[PDB]
Amino acid sequence: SALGKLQDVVNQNAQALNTLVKQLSSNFGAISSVLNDILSRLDPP
Amino acid sequence: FASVYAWNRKRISNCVADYSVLYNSASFSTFKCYGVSPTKLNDLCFTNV
């Protein structure tokens, strides 16, 4: 009133989940990152 | 109609754009859209033309 070996696990796991969430906003070479804006202004082919 | 090296640009704004009077009109030789589909232009909204 020390615990860094326990805070390291918490931090590493949050840092991985954040990267997974944030990769949902890359185009990977498409026109939009959001699927609804490809569906709305393009036709199936 | 101006020539190819001094083409004229008109900005369109503040109006409903009905491509229905244009897409169901069989009077043009080429109608090629890129990034959009000429049948879904009445569902979108645009910032400028």
PDB file of C-alpha atoms in Angstrom:
ATOM      1  CA  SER A   1       0.000   0.000   0.000  1.00  0.00           C
ATOM      2  CA  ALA A   2       5.027  -4.994  -7.776  1.00  0.00           C
ATOM      3  CA  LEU A   3       2.205  -6.579  -9.769  1.00  0.00           C
ATOM      4  CA  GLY A   4       3.657  -5.923 -13.221  1.00  0.00           C
ATOM      5  CA  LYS A   5       3.885  -9.624 -14.037  1.00  0.00           C
ATOM      6  CA  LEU A   6       0.089  -9.725 -13.892  1.00  0.00           C
ATOM      7  CA  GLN A   7      -0.438  -6.392 -15.627  1.00  0.00           C
ATOM      8  CA  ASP A   8       1.676  -7.621 -18.550  1.00  0.00           C
ATOM      9  CA  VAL A   9      -0.849 -10.337 -19.386  1.00  0.00           C
ATOM     10  CA  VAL A  10      -3.798  -7.920 -19.205  1.00  0.00           C
ATOM     11  CA  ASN A  11      -1.970  -5.406 -21.393  1.00  0.00           C
ATOM     12  CA  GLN A  12      -0.825  -7.910 -24.027  1.00  0.00           C
ATOM     13  CA  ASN A  13      -4.318  -9.299 -24.439  1.00  0.00           C
ATOM     14  CA  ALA A  14      -5.963  -5.885 -24.714  1.00  0.00           C
ATOM     15  CA  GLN A  15      -3.290  -4.834 -27.197  1.00  0.00           C
ATOM     16  CA  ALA A  16      -4.117  -7.830 -29.373  1.00  0.00           C
ATOM     17  CA  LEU A  17      -7.881  -7.311 -29.298  1.00  0.00           C
ATOM     18  CA  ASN A  18      -7.422  -3.647 -30.209  1.00  0.00           C
ATOM     19  CA  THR A  19      -5.418  -4.536 -33.311  1.00  0.00           C
ATOM     20  CA  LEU A  20      -8.041  -7.059 -34.348  1.00  0.00           C
ATOM     21  CA  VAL A  21     -10.786  -4.448 -33.996  1.00  0.00           C
ATOM     22  CA  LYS A  22      -8.808  -1.801 -35.852  1.00  0.00           C
ATOM     23  CA  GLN A  23      -8.014  -3.959 -38.865  1.00  0.00           C
ATOM     24  CA  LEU A  24     -11.717  -3.696 -39.735  1.00  0.00           C
ATOM     25  CA  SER A  25     -11.064  -0.318 -41.355  1.00  0.00           C
ATOM     26  CA  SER A  26      -8.475  -1.246 -43.979  1.00  0.00           C
ATOM     27  CA  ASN A  27      -9.456  -1.544 -47.636  1.00  0.00           C
ATOM     28  CA  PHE A  28      -6.950  -4.282 -48.478  1.00  0.00           C
ATOM     29  CA  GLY A  29      -7.084  -2.808 -51.967  1.00  0.00           C
ATOM     30  CA  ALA A  30     -10.842  -2.361 -52.362  1.00  0.00           C
ATOM     31  CA  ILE A  31     -12.829   0.814 -52.974  1.00  0.00           C
ATOM     32  CA  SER A  32     -14.359   1.115 -49.498  1.00  0.00           C
ATOM     33  CA  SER A  33     -13.649  -0.310 -46.079  1.00  0.00           C
ATOM     34  CA  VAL A  34     -17.359  -0.661 -45.255  1.00  0.00           C
ATOM     35  CA  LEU A  35     -19.224  -3.486 -46.968  1.00  0.00           C
ATOM     36  CA  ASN A  36     -22.543  -1.628 -47.184  1.00  0.00           C
ATOM     37  CA  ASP A  37     -20.968   1.085 -49.336  1.00  0.00           C
ATOM     38  CA  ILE A  38     -19.845  -1.570 -51.782  1.00  0.00           C
ATOM     39  CA  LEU A  39     -23.257  -3.217 -51.701  1.00  0.00           C
ATOM     40  CA  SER A  40     -25.190   0.032 -52.093  1.00  0.00           C
ATOM     41  CA  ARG A  41     -23.408   1.480 -55.124  1.00  0.00           C
ATOM     42  CA  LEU A  42     -22.419  -1.682 -56.990  1.00  0.00           C
ATOM     43  CA  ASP A  43     -24.225  -4.627 -58.554  1.00  0.00           C
ATOM     44  CA  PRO A  44     -23.482  -8.290 -57.788  1.00  0.00           C
ATOM     45  CA  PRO A  45     -20.916  -9.010 -60.548  1.00  0.00           C
TER      46      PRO A  45
ATOM     47  CA  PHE B   1     -19.867  22.329 -77.155  1.00  0.00           C
ATOM     48  CA  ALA B   2     -16.294  23.377 -76.454  1.00  0.00           C
ATOM     49  CA  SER B   3     -13.253  21.528 -77.804  1.00  0.00           C
ATOM     50  CA  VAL B   4     -11.172  18.826 -76.154  1.00  0.00           C
ATOM     51  CA  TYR B   5      -8.373  21.063 -74.835  1.00  0.00           C
ATOM     52  CA  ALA B   6     -10.696  23.762 -73.423  1.00  0.00           C
ATOM     53  CA  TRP B   7     -13.547  21.581 -72.152  1.00  0.00           C
ATOM     54  CA  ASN B   8     -16.291  23.275 -70.156  1.00  0.00           C
ATOM     55  CA  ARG B   9     -17.180  22.236 -66.608  1.00  0.00           C
ATOM     56  CA  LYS B  10     -20.564  22.933 -65.035  1.00  0.00           C
ATOM     57  CA  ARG B  11     -21.088  22.275 -61.337  1.00  0.00           C
ATOM     58  CA  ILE B  12     -24.423  20.734 -60.328  1.00  0.00           C
ATOM     59  CA  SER B  13     -25.795  21.142 -56.803  1.00  0.00           C
ATOM     60  CA  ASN B  14     -28.988  21.645 -54.770  1.00  0.00           C
ATOM     61  CA  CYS B  15     -31.406  19.437 -56.701  1.00  0.00           C
ATOM     62  CA  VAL B  16     -32.772  15.934 -56.918  1.00  0.00           C
ATOM     63  CA  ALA B  17     -30.872  14.173 -59.693  1.00  0.00           C
ATOM     64  CA  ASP B  18     -33.156  11.845 -61.644  1.00  0.00           C
ATOM     65  CA  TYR B  19     -31.025   9.531 -63.752  1.00  0.00           C
ATOM     66  CA  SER B  20     -34.306   7.727 -64.474  1.00  0.00           C
ATOM     67  CA  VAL B  21     -34.983  10.227 -67.248  1.00  0.00           C
ATOM     68  CA  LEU B  22     -31.478   9.312 -68.491  1.00  0.00           C
ATOM     69  CA  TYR B  23     -31.037   5.571 -67.880  1.00  0.00           C
ATOM     70  CA  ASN B  24     -34.347   4.446 -69.384  1.00  0.00           C
ATOM     71  CA  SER B  25     -33.501   6.771 -72.307  1.00  0.00           C
ATOM     72  CA  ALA B  26     -32.087   4.788 -75.239  1.00  0.00           C
ATOM     73  CA  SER B  27     -30.499   7.708 -77.078  1.00  0.00           C
ATOM     74  CA  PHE B  28     -26.749   7.550 -76.277  1.00  0.00           C
ATOM     75  CA  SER B  29     -23.962   5.468 -77.791  1.00  0.00           C
ATOM     76  CA  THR B  30     -21.952   4.845 -74.596  1.00  0.00           C
ATOM     77  CA  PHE B  31     -23.014   4.926 -70.907  1.00  0.00           C
ATOM     78  CA  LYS B  32     -20.066   3.619 -68.861  1.00  0.00           C
ATOM     79  CA  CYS B  33     -20.003   4.103 -65.091  1.00  0.00           C
ATOM     80  CA  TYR B  34     -16.930   3.476 -62.936  1.00  0.00           C
ATOM     81  CA  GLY B  35     -17.228   2.831 -59.209  1.00  0.00           C
ATOM     82  CA  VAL B  36     -21.036   2.934 -59.372  1.00  0.00           C
ATOM     83  CA  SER B  37     -23.780   1.075 -61.187  1.00  0.00           C
ATOM     84  CA  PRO B  38     -25.996   3.242 -63.415  1.00  0.00           C
ATOM     85  CA  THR B  39     -29.102   1.573 -61.969  1.00  0.00           C
ATOM     86  CA  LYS B  40     -28.422   2.508 -58.321  1.00  0.00           C
ATOM     87  CA  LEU B  41     -27.834   6.239 -58.779  1.00  0.00           C
ATOM     88  CA  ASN B  42     -31.278   7.163 -57.424  1.00  0.00           C
ATOM     89  CA  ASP B  43     -30.572   5.614 -54.005  1.00  0.00           C
ATOM     90  CA  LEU B  44     -27.365   7.533 -53.268  1.00  0.00           C
ATOM     91  CA  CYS B  45     -26.629  11.102 -52.280  1.00  0.00           C
ATOM     92  CA  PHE B  46     -23.693  13.131 -53.549  1.00  0.00           C
ATOM     93  CA  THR B  47     -21.755  16.153 -52.348  1.00  0.00           C
ATOM     94  CA  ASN B  48     -21.171  17.793 -55.742  1.00  0.00           C
ATOM     95  CA  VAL B  49     -21.520  17.042 -59.434  1.00  0.00           C
TER      96      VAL B  49
END
